[PDB]
Ligand binder design. Sequence first.
Ligand SMILES: O=C(O)CCCC[C@@H]1CCSS1
Length: 330
Amino acid sequence: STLRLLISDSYDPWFNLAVEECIFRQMPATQRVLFLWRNADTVVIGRAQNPWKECNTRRMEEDNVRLARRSSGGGAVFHDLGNTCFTFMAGKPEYDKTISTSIVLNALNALGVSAEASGRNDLVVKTVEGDRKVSGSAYRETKDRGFHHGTLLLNADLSRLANYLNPDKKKLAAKRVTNLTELLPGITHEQVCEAITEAFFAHYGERVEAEIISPNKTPDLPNFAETFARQSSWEWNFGQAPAFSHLLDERFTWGGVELHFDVEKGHITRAQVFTDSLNPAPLEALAGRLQGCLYRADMLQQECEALLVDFPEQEKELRELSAWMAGAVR
Ligand SMILES: O=C(O)CCCC[C@@H]1CCSS1
């Protein structure tokens, strides 16, 4: 029918991600999907980050910690088995975000916990010592569909991300969480799955069998095998470190940018751009128009700025980029 209920039985974060990417882009928004999963120890970076700058890869290797590059913008995120995770997808105009939020809150409520929406992402519980975050999430609407996923903090090690990242000095020179463990001592991932599952089946008035997917056999999602292959490949997750002879970076209110490149005979011969900005598009397309560019403040500014007409949301981002570059050349 309409509802699909997908339960990963696998801690493999490339498998879980592929599944996530299949929902966003393979499944028809004719379905209403709840997907519940969790990853073993993993840093997940945004698609335009450079992990050889951002992460302590040596420690990661030593401590056996996985890397995975999601396909969306933004920065690095930790996972362990003490995070329970949820993905909802459904089609429009039927579905908006308040729906999945509703479902999660009910389920928390059904666990003895009352929490609520704090800001645009998180859910928070009210505490004698103030607001304390239990759940981060992220949302996007598309043409045919909306998509919502997030994490519930059951028993995560928070502070671990620190040891796998690297000192970013500029990001440094420029700048409240609790586990459920602490409130319900016996709470399991399975238990927190039933809860959400029911709040889900409650909202829609129906139930369906759970599909227990794991990577030892193809889940029933179109093009999964290709999707899992790419998503798990070293070249996608890591990629070679960038090797060029010039570097420019800067931290901005809206993110860090490293710009790498070569100059021969006064023009750029190759160039690459990383960032942790929520939307990397306009940087991605910047590197795109920087190849061949006359290496001089005026042309760099010119190329940067021709991008405006197709990035009206990001006009400030571009302006500051332009400015920065001009000032940064000599
Ligand atoms: O992580 C973010 O900041 C954006 C998440 C947007 C969800 C997309 C749907 C399938 S994987 S990426």
